Amino acid sequence: TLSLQLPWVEKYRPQVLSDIVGNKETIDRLQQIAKDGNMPHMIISGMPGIGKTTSVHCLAHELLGRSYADGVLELNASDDRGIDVVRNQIKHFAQKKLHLPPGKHKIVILDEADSMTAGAQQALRRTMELYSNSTRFAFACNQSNKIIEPLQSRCAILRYSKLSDEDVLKRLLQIIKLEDVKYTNDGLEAIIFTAEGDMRQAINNLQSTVAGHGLVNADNVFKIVDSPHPLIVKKMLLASNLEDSIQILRTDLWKKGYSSIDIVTTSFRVTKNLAQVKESVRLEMIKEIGLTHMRILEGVGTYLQLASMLAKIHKLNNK
Amino acid sequence: SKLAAEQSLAQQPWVEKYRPKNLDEVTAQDHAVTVLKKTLKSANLPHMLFYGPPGTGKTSTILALTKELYGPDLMKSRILELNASDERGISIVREKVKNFARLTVSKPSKHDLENYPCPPYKIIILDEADSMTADAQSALRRTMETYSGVTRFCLICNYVTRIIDPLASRCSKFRFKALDASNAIDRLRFISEQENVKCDDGVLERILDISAGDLRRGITLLQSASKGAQYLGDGKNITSTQVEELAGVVPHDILIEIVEKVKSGDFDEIKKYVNTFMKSGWSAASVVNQLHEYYITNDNFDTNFKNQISWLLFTTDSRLNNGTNEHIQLLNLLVKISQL
Amino acid sequence: WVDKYRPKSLNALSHNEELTNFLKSLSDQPRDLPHLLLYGPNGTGKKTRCMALLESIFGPGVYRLKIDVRQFVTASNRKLELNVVSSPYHLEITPSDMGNNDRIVIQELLKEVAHRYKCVIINEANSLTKDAQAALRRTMEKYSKNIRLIMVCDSMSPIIAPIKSRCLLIRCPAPSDSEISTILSDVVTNERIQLETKDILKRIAQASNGNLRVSLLMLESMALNNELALKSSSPIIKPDWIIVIHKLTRKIVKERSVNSLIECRAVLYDLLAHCIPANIILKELTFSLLDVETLNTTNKSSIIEYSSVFDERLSLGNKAIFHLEGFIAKVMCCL
Amino acid sequence: MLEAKFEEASLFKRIIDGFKDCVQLVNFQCKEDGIIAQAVDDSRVLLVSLEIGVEAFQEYRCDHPVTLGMDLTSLSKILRCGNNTDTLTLIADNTPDSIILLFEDTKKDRIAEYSLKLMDIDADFLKIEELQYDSTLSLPSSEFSKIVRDLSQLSDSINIMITKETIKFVADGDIGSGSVIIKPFVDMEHPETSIKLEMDQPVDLTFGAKYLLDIIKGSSLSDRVGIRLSSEAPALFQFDLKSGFLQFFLAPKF
Amino acid sequence: MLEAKFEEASLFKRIIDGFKDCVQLVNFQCKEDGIIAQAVDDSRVLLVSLEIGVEAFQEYRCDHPVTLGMDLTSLSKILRCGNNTDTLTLIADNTPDSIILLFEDTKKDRIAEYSLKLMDIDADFLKIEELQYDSTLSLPSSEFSKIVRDLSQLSDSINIMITKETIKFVADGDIGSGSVIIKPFVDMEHPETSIKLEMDQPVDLTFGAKYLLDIIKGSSLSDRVGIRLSSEAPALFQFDLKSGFLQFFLAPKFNDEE
Amino acid sequence: SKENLPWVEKYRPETLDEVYGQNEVITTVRKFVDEGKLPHLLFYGPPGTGKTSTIVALAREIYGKNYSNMVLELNASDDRGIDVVRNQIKDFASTRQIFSKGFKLIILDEADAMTNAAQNALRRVIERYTKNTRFCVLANYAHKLTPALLSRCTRFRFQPLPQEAIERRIANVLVHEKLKLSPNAEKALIELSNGDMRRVLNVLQSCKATLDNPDEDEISDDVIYECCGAPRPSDLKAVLKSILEDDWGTAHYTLNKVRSAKGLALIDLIEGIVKILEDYELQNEETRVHLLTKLADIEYSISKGGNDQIQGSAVIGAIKASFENET
Ligand SMILES: Nc1ncnc2c1ncn2[C@@H]1O[C@H](COP(=O)(O)OP(=O)(O)OP(O)(O)=S)[C@@H](O)[C@H]1O
Ligand SMILES: Nc1ncnc2c1ncn2[C@@H]1O[C@H](COP(=O)(O)OP(=O)(O)OP(O)(O)=S)[C@@H](O)[C@H]1O
Ligand SMILES: Nc1ncnc2c1ncn2[C@@H]1O[C@H](COP(=O)(O)OP(=O)(O)OP(O)(O)=S)[C@@H](O)[C@H]1O
Ligand SMILES: Nc1ncnc2c1ncn2[C@@H]1O[C@H](COP(=O)(O)OP(=O)(O)O)[C@@H](O)[C@H]1O
Ligand SMILES: [Mg+2]
Ligand SMILES: [Mg+2]
Ligand SMILES: [Mg+2]
Incomplete structure (x- = not known):
């Protein structure tokens, strides 16, 4: 081996706002903005792998044309983004003179805005306020609560949502048509099921299954990627009889190499996000899980502790 | 030189005076010292993890092994001993331990290779690993995994659960067994004969019975009994009663009074007797242990009563093991077992 | 006064003759002396007996002592100030004068200090955190020819098992x-x-x-x-906090409601703010609540069970009022 | 065995000053024709390579090569006892666990001797030097240091561009941009100040300023510095010694 | 009263540089035959003792001894105004609450005057110097400083060993071991570089490197340093002044004792 | 020499053909490397499953014998902060190889101890430099990794070693060493392993040291049990039978003599009784609830110390009271 090929997430990364199968409303909004111009300060929030960075990249590219190289300032979490950088480099870029069309503006893209320190975020306020006629700011984050309210007050808020089954299925069908891959309906269904609204993870699993077996079938997808972990944990907690839950925990989780910490933590998440049972029984189950979590953090993490946690949860559910 | 060491050992308490210097002095932990003696002729000493009750001889065993391996000359140059009295955070583990592991082994002298095997690796021991944080422990993983050719890691702890699973998997687990009367009577009799401790027939076996698998506490009790018998100068032999008096054991009659107050009596009488008993200083753990022995051993109670007494004593011991007030816990235990 | 009439030697003790004889036996040969741990009820006279034993191991100059100061630097620039009681034959440290920084003082001071040896008196060993006790575990054994520990405590319950094994245990029963x-x-x-x-x-x-x-x-x-x-009927002088606790128990047995729980929390706050430990508060409150003749055995059993549970909670927690108010509410619910 | 005596401890101290900071571990090897040493930084973008011939020493004896690895920091910590004028002798047996540094004054008077613990490093000397480089240039090393010190303030990247009869150093960052342009020239009034340039092909490479800053230290060993650049390999910055040289190979950016 | 005028403020500044860092409180006492001062560090392993005779001053008047204690740090903070060439006069009444430092230039021009607050310290001067020491040696102080600076890097303990015609300093720690061996010798080309040694008994003592490092500061006061060692007492390192001396007494490590 | 390394280090796999147990992931990785499309890998699994050995053998097969120079291997032992990422990882990804031509490999072993800021800075390094370098993240707990970083890599779960592969490795070791092993001894060895090759190798070396002979004899179950201090199924079932059927005092005496004759531990007996009672077909689940709760409480109490006799009596009483509801 001498060199590798580009992954399908990067190779087929959308370069035009029409290729994005994300939230239709915000996509058409950004398309009309790039068509008319006058892009305002924006903050795009959501979950990983739904088309946030690609969306702002496509918007900046379409809005700047060939001037993207000298009119767009990209700053990721991999670069220093402290108070000194905001004071010197961002201010020098915002004060920089640049002849642009009468409908465009310089764009400052800040990826992972939820990781910037409080001082830099505070200094960015007047930085974006005094140069709001020749410099525009686009933040891309996962938690909008991590950005201070003064910064959110000077910008639009775009909350991206999970991708429905239809959109990811359409994108995967387009990728298969562009790549000439042998697939089947159940295989694509299993891929979308294991993706959980994550387009990047879906394309990655598809490419991995293709390069590992060639045929995208549910058997191959399940043998190369385990079932959604939270779902087996939910089925274990929602069991009606103790022996069924014990057998599930033994075979599916413990005999496959899942650590006790992952089991208990996944267990906590499943419960917190549960809606089948009432609030009080959910709180009691969370209490028992958290007592098991305590025991486990002290190094007493074994199968007996999880079995006792399940027994206590069933006793709580035993009226 | 050596004579000063002999005199300092002779003027030292019996715990440090009779510390095992060779791997043969270990009386009961034979399974571990057998492997340690076999690997002494070879050169494939693996990473080890000693765990067990306190006073079983882990530190003594590793010290004797390092001595028999390196000699009294290389004993101070090829050993990195880190105790709980030192800082063992992530910074220390990353800087000092890793710098010592990455360093090369010191050259042995001409007198070293003639009498000792002098293995091509050094030993880094970490005593009382229970106090080490899990992140500083995970930092040791690749440090001990990649530099195994030049250094060997020896962890020592009492609770094996306090050490993370990867570290427990990387090291060979050596469990030190409790030193009861059976496997420690020989060592106790040797210590008694070497000090001319004139005792009765069933004293030594009783001492270890009070020790509950702890040779250090047994040797301390033997030294105290010998001092108390030498001060009197009567020339008689030490009795089991004199030993259990200074060992913190409640007399049998005082325990029978507690059994009578529990069997027959109300809350007020039991509370008054507990308030009177707490005036005389007794450790609540010893009282709970004696009550457990009496209740489980006596063949005059129902099995349904025995399950409940066992669970109540277990709960009381678990509560006392957290630094609680002995009076409140003892009163609650006696009241709960009186309602049975 | 307590201090004007206090024994200074072993022959000046006036109670627990068997304990005095045991101390004389232990001080007959002073160089081959292991570490000692004096345990028993508070106020028995163990701190006087330890000094009397030192007076037998060394000259009478053991009581002529002085108070010095030593500074320590933690992981941050917070300066730990600790006063030390020192003598030309021994020294006394009380790690109960600070927070979670007992381990630093213990290890550094004992390593610096480490007949022929210098005695060390650790006062109130129950306040020693588990990490400080673990640090002292190996210091007790590594330096046994220069440093001997005499730890004075009131209950070996919070003392770890390794430390218990590493020293002789001497019980001091309260005098008749x-x-x-x-x-x-x-x-x-x-x-x-x-x-x-x-x-x-x-x-x-x-x-x-x-x-x-x-x-x-x-x-x-x-x-x-x-x-x-x-006179023949001189009143008994009780401390103020005991009277406050008695009034609190009267309020408890008289009214059981949330409005009374508020004033109970206020009384607990006023007691805690005036240098009164919460464990002693709970002990006295429970013991004086059991003395209430209005309650029955069913109430007293539940009271003692809840007091044990919340004593464990307080020994595992740091916000003491968070457990005291819970115990008071549980007692109110019981009655 | 190792037995190398330096006339002046100062030479060895300046040589080690060159490895200093930019590398942690150094692998030395003495042999019949002298001593060599190599050290690579953690990111593997810089290789420091030394060669000291037999003639650079006042006394050198080798009947059996010895390879020894050590921590650079430990070595420099000990490398300030030379009084510069002291005599320094490096000593080691054929299977060493340590390296002995022996500093002595002319008279029998004061003898400072050190026994440094060695590290075991898998012997794997690199031989990445090229036959021909795209361009070659030499100039006073103090001048090169100034050029690097200027530009460093502006950016973490300094570009070196070579065209016929033109060498241009450039940095461009937040506060602005800077450039230093030098031209080849022969100064007969003293040729140690001349600037030579042989260009077979124009070159244009970018280097991390932090590394060039480490490299300029060699000025203390030689009046001139040779810089060899290629689009096919790490750049070579070389500082000649009397019988020997200190070389820094630096991988260009992307 | 206290009335001591130093020709050059520099002498006093270098003297105080010697107490600097290693001690916090200093107890001075002026009297008919001069000024003495003593300071002991917190751990009590180092005593710094000064003696300045009447002749070291340009003007000295004392009809009534005065003892005064002060914080060393406060004093040095003020001790950088001497211009070195300035004249310095120490002034205090018989029952002082302060000590006045008066720096003046030759001409009436500039007069810097300070009034330093004093601390109350129980007067208790120690007299721990011995009649005879096991061994005595002197050598250039810059040489002693280098010897200490070398070894310090290797360990927190530096051992001094003396045998007939041999003085050996040794340090041994983590990275390895080091030693400096010097031999007695008379240099007529200039005897201030000679190394004298009088040994009545071989000695071998260990000292905490941190303390020897504090002590080497005396080099700035004298060309030579005298070192007196004994197995019965603290070692004495002495730096002579014109009419006076600065002495450092350091307790040997017992095994762990600075 | 390799004869000085322990058996865990001496028998470390150097090629991908020596990594047993993992077949579905090993074949897929081999295909990834042969065909060229090697994505960012995330090896998640328990300790001792062979993740580090797998990635080391993979890098060896990819770059050759010069693996130690063309691969950037970072672990918890090395300082892994956000600045460390920014400088070292970005300079490694942005530049090219100094020894050959090809893609680079960054092995972030034990990356579950990295800071959240470090992962937030690295998640954009993995996405930006993806044409000249790759990323391999090894983890034991998938909860310590941010979901953003967890979604950029292809996840491979290292299952515990099954019976066939662990027996194959045991046979390989018995071929490499002058040693013989009994079949029942081998089964008991596989039972006390839980799919951990480290434990098997360590106890195999230890029982070879226990042999005391020039290795002309075999290693039986007695040697393994006496060397690892693990209880035997015989004594386990005897204690369980005496607890379930015999009298209280007789059960106490039996437990005492069993735990004192071989020096067994109470925690090992607890785990063994839990494993045995898991196959018991029981009545209404209340008995199982009580049993599991009380046994877990006693185990958590043992994990902190106390009286061994009191805890043994507690185990006996808990099992008895739990089974008293089955009538
Ligand atoms: N709506 C979409 N249509 C097509 N491809 C998409 C879409 N969303 C994501 N992708 C794919 O996922 C890759 C990465 O998308 P990103 O925008 O970087 O994810 P993200 O939404 O920004 O979440 P992060 O970066 O983890 S906070 C792209 O290069 C595409 O290949
Ligand atoms: N097996 C043994 N044979 C002989 N003496 C022993 C043995 N075990 C303990 N001792 C004695 O007990 C002393 C203490 O030994 P240690 O090794 O410190 O005990 P320990 O296992 O380290 O307990 P810790 O430190 O609290 S975990 C030794 O110096 C011996 O005098
Ligand atoms: N599948 C396997 N085949 C053969 N030997 C193995 C296998 N897995 C583990 N081993 C042995 O166990 C040793 C340790 O393997 P590692 O890969 O370091 O464990 P790990 O899977 O990385 O888990 P960690 O390091 O605790 S997170 C190897 O050197 C081998 O001797
Ligand atoms: N042998 C003794 N004879 C008479 N009074 C004593 C004796 N020992 C102690 N006391 C006094 O009894 C009281 C005991 O309380 P205290 O000294 O605080 O106990 P402790 O020494 O345990 O701290 C004090 O007044 C103490 O002086
Ligand atoms: Mg993104
Ligand atoms: Mg120990
Ligand atoms: Mg690993």
């Missing part, structure tokens, strides 16, 4: 009421007090629960109210 009465007799004949009937002294013992430190202090406090002449 008769010995307390005989001591108070010598004190009142030396302080020139007027006793109409001797039995009052016995009652003092019956009000002290074996505590000699409390007994002498209460005798002197009631001698100032009776103007150096104790």
